[PDB]
Design a protein around this ligand. Structure first.
Ligand code: HEC
Ligand code: HEM
Ligand code: HEM
Ligand SMILES: CCCCCCCCCCS[C@@H]1O[C@H](CO)[C@@H](O[C@H]2O[C@H](CO)[C@@H](O)[C@H](O)[C@H]2O)[C@H](O)[C@H]1O
Ligand SMILES: [Ca+2]
Ligand SMILES: [Fe+3]
Ligand SMILES: [O]
Lengths: 142, 449
């Protein structure tokens, strides 16, 4: 069991699994349009992503459980606050009342967002909840 | 060799930045429980990106330093250009401090305007909060770096250590390009985010880490280079076997196929192996020494690094890598418990290990410090190492209770996010204590120079 043998397991066995991975992604990236519902991915859903990106919501929150653990999960906040019909109006009020300023409670900043910005946000968050996320989370609370 | 003293600044600035990291840790740690602490001046999300971007930045400075140190010795020739090594340092260090101050002095949406993210949107993703310009800067540096130490291996000996280390570093910089690809499709975005984070920390960085450990074990134990380099190749092979498909453990609940649940859970079960090898690798070679080494701390660091990495990455990694478990823990204080030990045990400790080796012989003190500095390093070691096992325990507690209250019950019995967080408060205070002890232990470690 020489140093030439061990060095080849690393060389060959990794080239194998890179391909297998890259082959595995190629397939996966074909199923995406259907699992994510790319039809429903309007320029609103997309502009909403950028608002999300631009104010670093992920630095307090999680989205499909990825992010920061300071504030609630938001991939499923729709079904918790007014559902698909009443969610936007909610986020509208919710974004402009921050910070609540109840002492010693975790704060959210005021982001000075336009109603068009907050609406795309809502559209982005709604589209996100309707992604085939293999039945995650367990429940409504995130 | 004499050009190895360009690794000295890299090592110091790494430790400087390492102190910045722990402070902002401590702030956030407190914001958990005193919600409006430093609000609205420094919101939690700003402290967090400073905390984590200091970690990622001080680990690179730490990895580069190690290469600037150990690649001359391995190549049996002087560094290709010590001019470059210093020019890059200052660029990188300027680039780092500016980017950090950007987070701190301007509102993030403003910083996105200022640096003009609209043209090339890459901001606002976890660990990749830096402006595009800053990423570009990091790549330039990482290219200058690669080239400089890349040439040194060509014009000199080609030991396995030096080769693998170059692979890991090349691979580090390549994968970091995916920080520029920022899909409009959220699930597409997440898929390719894990090519940066996971293939770094569970693939390509394990080569960096392994290589340094092996380089350190050659010098302090005096064991045959030929069995060390053999063992090295085993550990690496096991890393890329388990880890490349093992990526799938991040692909459960983000909107990609369910077949990843099997693939990710099967291959991830294997990812603690490399780490288990690492401890056997340390313990044997350090146990069959042709040498009692004048710096007793290095041996402690090398053995500890391998254990802590096994506990954090391996054990804590396994505990929640199985889709059935991961489902209830995904994005919980448990995830934070693991990340902390796994990052610290693997990469913080390995940077400190090689510093503990090379620093005296970068100041020309000797192979070791005197007995003062040595019993301090080792005090620091233990305070920090033991501080962090508590940090992970306390947070593991939170995470388990949190799964209990919020995650497992069905709609209605499931307690609210912000309501369960109130139950967890004690653990979070205990964690702040552990965090303080840690800062003490870092200061102990730091006084040993
Ligand atoms: C884009 C920049 C952001 C969006 C969109 C949202 N946030 Fe936050 N957030 C934070 C805290 C501490 C709370 C809890 C508030 C309380 O209960 O006192 C929240 C809450 C929300 C909610 C309501 C979710 C629910 O189910 O109750 C939504 C819809 C929401 N946030 C959206 C904190 C922070 C924070 C800390 C510095 C940041 C940067 C953001 N939030 C950003 C966004
Ligand atoms: C010592 C005191 C420390 C404190 C008080 C602290 C606190 C924190 C906090 C509050 C977060 C954010 C939690 C959230 O997202 O909601 C965090 C994140 C993180 N910290 Fe620390 N930290 C400390 C030290 C460390 C150390 C020593 C490391 C060394 C490796 C480290 C690595 C990380 C990493 C990787 C994250 C991102 C974790 C994730 O997303 O899962 N931290 N820390
Ligand atoms: C030194 C090596 C490792 C480091 C630094 C590390 C670090 C991290 C970090 C920081 C996260 C959370 C990031 C985020 O969501 O922002 C994470 C997630 C995770 N890690 Fe690792 N890890 C390592 C090795 C491993 C090992 C080897 C395994 C499997 C045995 C493991 C299993 C997991 C799992 C299952 C998650 C997902 C938690 C979630 O669902 O969000 N990790 N890791
Ligand atoms: C070594 C083990 C490797 C196993 C790899 C394959 C794992 C696939 C198993 C399914 S993953 C996940 O499991 C969940 C059950 O915990 C399943 O949840 C089920 O029950 C939940 C309540 O308990 C409920 O919220 C869901 O709507 C219900 O579908 C979930 O669907 C499934 O994706
Ligand atoms: Ca996270
Ligand atoms: Fe991983
Ligand atoms: O991971």
């Amino acid at each position: 069991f020489t140093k030439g043998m061990a060095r080849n397991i690393y060389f060959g066995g990794s080239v194998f699994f890179i391909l297998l991975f890259l082959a595995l992604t190629y397939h996966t990236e074909k199923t995406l349009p259907e699992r994510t519902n790319e039809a429903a991915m309007s320029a609103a859903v997309v502009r909403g992503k950028l608002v999300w990106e631009q104010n670093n919501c992920v630095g307090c929150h999680t989205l499909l459980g990825e992010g920061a653990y300071f504030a609630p999960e938001l991939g499923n906040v729709v079904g918790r606050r007014g559902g698909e019909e009443g969610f936007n109006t909610f986020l509208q009020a919710w974004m402009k009342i921050q910070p609540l300023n109840v002492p010693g409670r975790r704060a959210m900043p005021q982001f000075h967002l336009s109603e068009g910005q907050v609406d795309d946000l809502a559209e982005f968050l709604k589209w996100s909840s309707k992604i085939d996320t293999n039945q995650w989370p367990p429940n409504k609370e995130g | 060799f004499a050009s190895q003293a360009v690794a000295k600044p890299y090592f110091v600035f790494a430790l400087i930045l390492f102190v910045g990291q722990i402070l902002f840790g401590l702030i956030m740690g407190l914001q958990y429980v005193v919600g409006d602490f430093l609000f609205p001046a420094i919101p939690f999300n700003v402290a967090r990106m400073v905390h984590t971007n200091l970690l990622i930045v001080w680990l690179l400075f730490g990895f580069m330093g190690a290469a600037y140190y150990l690649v001359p010795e391995e190549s049996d020739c002087e560094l290709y250009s010590p001019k470059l090594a210093w020019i890059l340092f200052w660029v990188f260090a300027a680039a780092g401090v500016l980017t950090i101050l950007g987070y701190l002095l301007v509102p993030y949406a403003g910083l996105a305007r200022l640096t003009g993210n609209e043209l090339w949107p890459t901001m606002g993703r976890e660990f990749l909060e830096q402006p595009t310009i800053s990423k570009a800067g990091i790549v330039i540096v990482a290219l200058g770096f690669l080239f400089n130490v890349g040439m040194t291996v060509l014009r000199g000996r080609k030991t396995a250590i030096s080769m693998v280390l170059m692979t890991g570093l090349i691979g580090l910089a390549l994968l970091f390009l995916f920080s520029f690809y920022n899909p409009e499709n959220l699930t597409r975005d997440k898929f390719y985010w894990w090519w940066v984070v996971h293939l770094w920390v569970e693939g390509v960085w394990e080569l960096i880490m392994g290589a340094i450990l092996a380089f350190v074990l050659v010098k302090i134990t005096g064991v045959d280079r030929e069995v060390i380099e053999k063992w090295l190749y085993v550990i690496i092979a096991m890393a890329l076997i388990s880890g490349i498909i093992g990526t799938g453990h991040h692909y459960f609940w983000i909107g990609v196929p369910g077949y990843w649940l099997w693939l990710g859970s099967v291959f991830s079960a294997l990812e603690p192996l490399p780490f288990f090898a690492m401890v056997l690798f340390a313990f044997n070679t350090i146990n069959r020494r042709r040498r009692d080494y004048p710096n007793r701390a290095v041996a402690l660091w090398a053995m500890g690094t391998t254990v802590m990495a096994f506990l954090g990455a391996g054990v804590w990694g396994f505990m929640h890598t199985l889709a059935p478990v991961n489902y209830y823990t995904h994005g919980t204080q448990l995830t934070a418990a693991h990340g902390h030990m796994a990052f610290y045990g693997a990469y913080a400790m390995i940077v400190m290990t090689i510093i503990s080796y090379a620093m005296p012989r970068l100041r020309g003190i000797g192979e070791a410090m005197d007995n003062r500095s040595q019993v301090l390093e080792m005090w620091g070691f233990w305070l920090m190492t033991v501080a962090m096992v508590f940090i992970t325990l306390f947070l593991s507690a939170a995470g388990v209770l949190q799964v209990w209250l919020q995650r497992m019950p069905a709609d209605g019995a499931a307690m609210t996010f912000m309501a369960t967080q109130d139950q967890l408060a004690i653990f979070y205070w205990l964690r702040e204590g552990a965090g303080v002890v840690f800062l003490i232990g870092l200061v102990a470690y730091l006084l040993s120079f």
